[PDB]
Amino acid sequence: RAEPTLKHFDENIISLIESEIMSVNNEIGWADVAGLEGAKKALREIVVLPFKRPDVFTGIRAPPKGVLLFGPPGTGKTMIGRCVASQCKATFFNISASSLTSKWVGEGEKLVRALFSVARLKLPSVIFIDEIDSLLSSHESSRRIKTEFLVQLDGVNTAPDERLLVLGATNRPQELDEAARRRFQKRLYIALPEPESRTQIVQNLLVGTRHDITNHNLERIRELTDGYSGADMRQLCTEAAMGPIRDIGDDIETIDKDDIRAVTVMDFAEAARVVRPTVDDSQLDAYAAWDKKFGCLP
Numbered sequence: 284r285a286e287p288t289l290k291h292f293d294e295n296i297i298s299l300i301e302s303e304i305m306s307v308n309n310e311i312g313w314a315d316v317a318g319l320e321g322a323k324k325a326l327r328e329i330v331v332l333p334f335k336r337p338d339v340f341t342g343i344r345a346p347p348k349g350v351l352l353f354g355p356p357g358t359g360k361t362m363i364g365r366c367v368a369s370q371c372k373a374t375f376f377n378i379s380a381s382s383l384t385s386k387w388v389g390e391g392e393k394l395v396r397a398l399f400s401v402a403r404l405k406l407p408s409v410i411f412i413d414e415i416d417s418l419l420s421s422h423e424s425s426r427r428i429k430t431e432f433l434v435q436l437d438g439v440n441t442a443p444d445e446r447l448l449v450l451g452a453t454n455r456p457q458e459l460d461e462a463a464r465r466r467f468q469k470r471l472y473i474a475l476p477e478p479e480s481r482t483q484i485v486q487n488l489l490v491g492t493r494h495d496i497t498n499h500n501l502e503r504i505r506e507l508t509d510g511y512s513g514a515d516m517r518q519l520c521t522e523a524a525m526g527p528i529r530d531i532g533d534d535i536e537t538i539d540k541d542d543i544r545a546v547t548v549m550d551f552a553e554a555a556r557v558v559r560p561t562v563d564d565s566q567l568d569a570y571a572a573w574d575k576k577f578g579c580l581p
Contacts, residue, residue: 284297284301288400289397289404292393292397293390293393293397296390296393296394297401299387299394300376300397300398300401304376304377304378305374305375305401306365306376307375308368310369311369311370312366312369312370313366314362314365314366315483315487316359316362317358317359317476317480317481317484317513318359318480319473319474319477319480321580322471322474325469326350326363326471329346329469330350330370330371330409330450331370333345333346333446334371334407334448337444337446341444345443346448347469348436348439348440348447349439349448349449349467349468349469350449350450350451350467350468350470350471351415351464351470352364352451352452352453352471353453353470353471353472353570353573354474354570355473355474355475355561355562355567356454356514356561356562357512357514358474358476358512358513360473361377361452364377364409364450364452365377367409367450368411371407371446372407373407373446373448374406374407374409376398376401376402376410377411377413378398379412379413379414380412380414380415380418381413383395383418384417384418384424384425384428388424388428391424391427391428392427392431395431395435396431396435398410399438399439403447406445407446408447408448409448410447411450412452413452414452414454414455415452415453416453416456416458416459418432419458419459419466420458420459420460420463433466436466437466449466451466451467456470457569457573470577470579471579471580472570472574472578475567476511476513476516478505480513481505481508481516482505484516484517485519485520486501488516488520489546492546493527493541493543493546494546495545495547496546496551500547500548503552504548504551507551507552508555510560511558512560512561512562515559515561519555522550522554523546523553524546524550525550525554526546527546531543
């Protein structure tokens with residue numbers, strides 16, 4: 284890297300950040316996400332507008348240095364992070380906590396440290412940390428990678444107007460002590476998609492696939508998919524899409540792709556019998572309870 288301020292980091296490490304972790308994608312808009320409108324408006328207020336207008340969002344309007352996305356898995360918390368970053372024309376730094384403590388154990392400390400320095404250099408910056416519950420919970424390499432990470436977090440709070448936010452995500456927020464939670468002054472519950480969002484997803488996933496799903500069919504798909512996460516929804520569509528494939532048996536080997544039957548609601552009805560929602564009501568009750576004590580969404 285030509286950056287004079289990163290000449291003291293391993294070239295391999297900077298090279299890593301550059302090609303796997305750092306991205307700039309400013310054309311995602313809000314991506315018409317299945318993400319709830321309440322969350323959407325919150326991180327608009329908590330992140331996007333404080334990044335756009337640092338002059339307005341000061342005093343009590345000032346953004347927190349850390350935001351926690353928590354809830355059931357398969358809600359696409361990562362893509363939300365990516366949108367949020369795009370929304371404020373921030374440099375996106377996408378990293379997984381497993382990657383730090385597994386894939387990249389060797390020089391994990393240097394990577395964490397270099398990540399915050401590159402972030403600091405490319406302001407405004409969003410650092411998205413997947414499955415942050417790992418990092419923040421309490422073999423030996425983990426200790427330093429975590430320590431170094433805690434050091435870096437407390438280090439962002441050494442400059443008021445740096446448009447640098449750490450966005451952590453977890454499917455297991457209960458695994459976070461009074462001290463890990465403190466690092467994240469705002470904590471948004473990302474809920475399972477609402478009925479409207481379930482169908483928007485179906486529609487999204489069906490493009491490029493021949494289907495005869497009507498506007499009325501969607502009502503049905505809604506009642507079929509109560510309790511589904513987005514991921515469950517995707518699994519559903521894939522299953523449904525198999526319908527036209529199975530009907531033709533051995534003809535799949537020779538059939539013209541356009542002569543394959545259209546996906547119908549019947550396919551979804553049948554597919555709903557096969558797919559199973561990933562999270563049970565216990566997990567939901569738990570999230571909801573945690574959200575009551577430490578959450579900030581209404």
